[PDB]
């Protein structure tokens, strides 16, 4: 009685994990529309997260530089005109 029920609950639990793997797979560019085992999905997700965190960090790095540039230019435009 409780045996068949427990078995159904466990199957349902595994199914949710299956759906979650699919949603994860859909999030990594290299796995989209591709075939991969669960081990590959976890491994590629991990490498992609490291890669992205170093990619955005570089993005912010280029942004702050432009930030320092525009601030200086703003200084010049200020101290310039029809003196």
């Amino acid at each position: 009685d409780k045996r068949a029920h427990h078995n159904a609950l466990e199957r349902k639990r595994r199914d949710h994990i299956k759906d979650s793997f699919h949603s994860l797979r859909d999030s990594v560019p290299s796995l989209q529309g591709e075939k991969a085992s669960r081990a590959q999905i976890l491994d590629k997700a991990t490498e992609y997260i490291q890669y992205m965190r170093r990619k955005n960090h570089t993005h912010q790095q280029d942004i702050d530089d432009l930030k320092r540039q525009n601030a200086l230019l703003e200084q010049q435009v200020r101290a310039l005109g029809g003196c």
Binding site: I17, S23, R38, L42, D43, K55, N56, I63
Partner: protein, 88 residues
């Protein structure tokens, strides 16, 4: 007999496979800020949160690209202004 050897091989190879999969789960968990002090996070929570985190990083890139593009156009504008004003 062979059937018994095959059974034992299956058990040992699958056990090892589980172990390696757990390794992969832990490695991924370690890359999610939100799971910093939650080493016991169940498999499904690691999946859902890794997914949430990835989506945030991508959207986060789309914002950074939009900002850099704006800062660049801004820079050339400032320079264009300097040229119009001339020196003192």
């Amino acid at each position: 007999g062979h059937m018994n050897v095959k059974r034992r091989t299956h058990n040992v190879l699958e056990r090892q496979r589980r172990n390696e999969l757990k390794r992969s789960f832990f490695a991924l968990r370690d890359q999610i800020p939100e799971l910093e002090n939650n080493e016991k996070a169940p498999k499904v929570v690691i999946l859902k949160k890794a997914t949430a985190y990835i989506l945030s990083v991508q959207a986060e890139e789309q914002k950074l690209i939009s900002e850099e593009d704006l800062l660049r156009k801004r820079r050339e504008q400032l320079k264009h202004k300097l040229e119009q004003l001339g020196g003192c």
